[PDB]
Design a protein around this ligand. Structure first.
Ligand code: CLR
Ligand code: CLR
Ligand code: CLR
Ligand code: CLR
Ligand code: CLR
Ligand code: CLR
Lengths: 101, 101, 101, 101, 101, 101
């Protein structure tokens, strides 16, 4: 099976529990309604968190391939790693505030 | 039997359990009625998910052929693998939200 | 007997068990009546699958002849195999939905 | 402006007048209601017609490539032209019935 | 415009006045209902007539291409022309009966 | 000023009048209410169109640099151009359907 091989290499560029955690709390706040406090900050915090994770996922997909095919661009490769590290860093900050609120 | 060989080679370019999972809940949400909540997001999420899987399968069918007949275009083949990985990646992200909602 | 030889070679160009499977539900959905839910999506889904199986079978009949008589046109023969695989891939996707619905 | 250059090349691979004609009548039949006759055959005919135009467009987009970059694979190139011609041939036949109904 | 060129090339493989006539009378007999006599023969004759025209059109698309790319197989091309001529012969015979009834 | 040059180089990578059109129609459909018909298809089509426009903008931003610094990999650049053309094709189809509805 070729799709399973693609699926295995596609789940290796992200985590599963956090999106399941993110989706479950996004679902809970939606049904409760705008009457509940912190509705507006929670929706935007989840939305920006999901977008950043998607951007990191596509970033990681195209990054590990440079680790094998052509590592000549030593300077460029490190800068991409730091950007991925920084994007994950801001992701966990939103998740810290999401759980707190 | 020549059709059996085609079916085996075409069933190996995708997964089956996920497609039945999408179709089973698609019937459930459609027959349940628009009155129940999350009807609209589930319908569009399943619809876009199914469309991408067809595109991935079509992408994969024309992909494994180049792995044997002519591997000279390494750059084009390597990028095509990355695009397939990204499309599968966004499929599992949508599927995570479908089960949650 | 020459017709028996043609029948054997023509039955190898398609699958058999699925055909009565498609035919049996087509009779059931037609006999039960339009009042039964999901009637309309069932007829079109069965109809398109039946049309595509005929196209695939016709494609398979004219394809194996080139495999022995004249295999020089490798590029054209290779693409025909991919088209046959892609067409069958649509068949398996569609049949999943009739089974689910 | 680079986007407009892409748009000009992308509009050269399809027709606009038929698409608005298909979309205008799709809106009319949908908004009119299922009470009027020929509701279903019109919807499925437009739907299969619309899918084929997208399939023709992507076929034509990747077909202009081979006429200039590498015309060495002639036999594959002529066959792809016939498939592109065949796909459009079905589209006009379908549109004839849409106009009549 | 490349789609217009394909449409023009696919327009030369069939006629318009006959298809619109067939579709117009198909709508008339269908709307009137089975109460009006000759309903069953009219539907089947129009149905088989339309099927052959698509087969003739697809036949003509793949036939004129051999007239220019590779005319070496004169014997096979001659037989194909007779089949196309024969297929048109039954089409015009069938259409005579549709007008008569 | 260095920010003005970046603004010009970023505005040259996309079309703007379509952006005011999309924003205005989105505001209209959002404000006038869900009671209006075609509300949901309009909203989802506008959303996917905007997402695709951002994707095309990013593609063009990262592709224009590739045209000058290192043109050695012709195949990858040409395939990226084809992908951008197809994305603009689907964007213009979605915008046609938005205008129709
Ligand atoms: C804009 C930032 C802050 C968030 C969004 C990030 C996403 C959409 C973008 C921004 C930077 C982009 C990367 C920039 C450079 C490269 C190197 C190239 O050879 C492969 C693609 C890759 C790896 C890009 C992938 C997409 C990318 C990760
Ligand atoms: C339009 C994109 C974003 C989503 C839909 C993907 C489908 C419709 C398209 C987009 C990319 C396409 C592929 C791009 C390149 C090639 C290499 C060619 O030698 C065989 C076909 C193949 C493999 C194409 C098949 C069709 C394809 C898979
Ligand atoms: C039109 C498409 C999308 C669906 C219908 C498929 C049928 C009607 C058509 C489309 C492509 C066609 C094939 C194209 C090329 C050849 C190779 C030739 O040596 C024998 C006929 C054969 C094998 C054709 C048989 C009929 C065929 C299979
Ligand atoms: C599945 C068929 C019957 C209908 C849908 C057609 C679309 C989705 C598919 C089927 C055949 C495909 C083409 C097959 C071969 C080529 C030649 C290659 O150099 C570029 C991609 C291109 C041009 C593909 C693009 C996508 C394509 C046009
Ligand atoms: C079976 C007959 C009586 C009716 C149906 C006709 C259609 C479906 C079939 C039957 C014979 C077929 C043709 C047989 C041989 C060729 C020559 C080849 O170079 C291109 C395809 C082409 C032109 C085929 C196209 C499809 C075709 C015309
Ligand atoms: C996922 C696809 C189908 C739609 C979304 C497109 C965006 C998110 C992605 C997918 C393809 C990506 C591009 C793929 C390849 C390259 C070439 C490199 O030199 C610069 C980055 C660039 C240009 C990427 C930028 C980000 C990109 C445009």
């Amino acid at each position: 099976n070729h799709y399973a091989s693609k699926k295995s290499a596609a789940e290796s560029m992200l985590d599963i529990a956090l999106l399941m955690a993110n989706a479950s709390q996004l679902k809970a706040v939606v049904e409760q309604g705008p009457s509940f406090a912190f509705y507006v900050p929670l929706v935007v915090l989840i939305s920006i968190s999901l977008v950043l994770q998607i951007g990191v996922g596509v970033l990681l997909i195209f990054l590990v391939k440079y680790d094998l095919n052509n590592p000549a661009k030593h300077a460029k490769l490190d800068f991409l790693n730091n950007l991925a590290t920084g994007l994950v860093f801001i992701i966990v900050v939103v998740n810290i505030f999401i759980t707190a609120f």
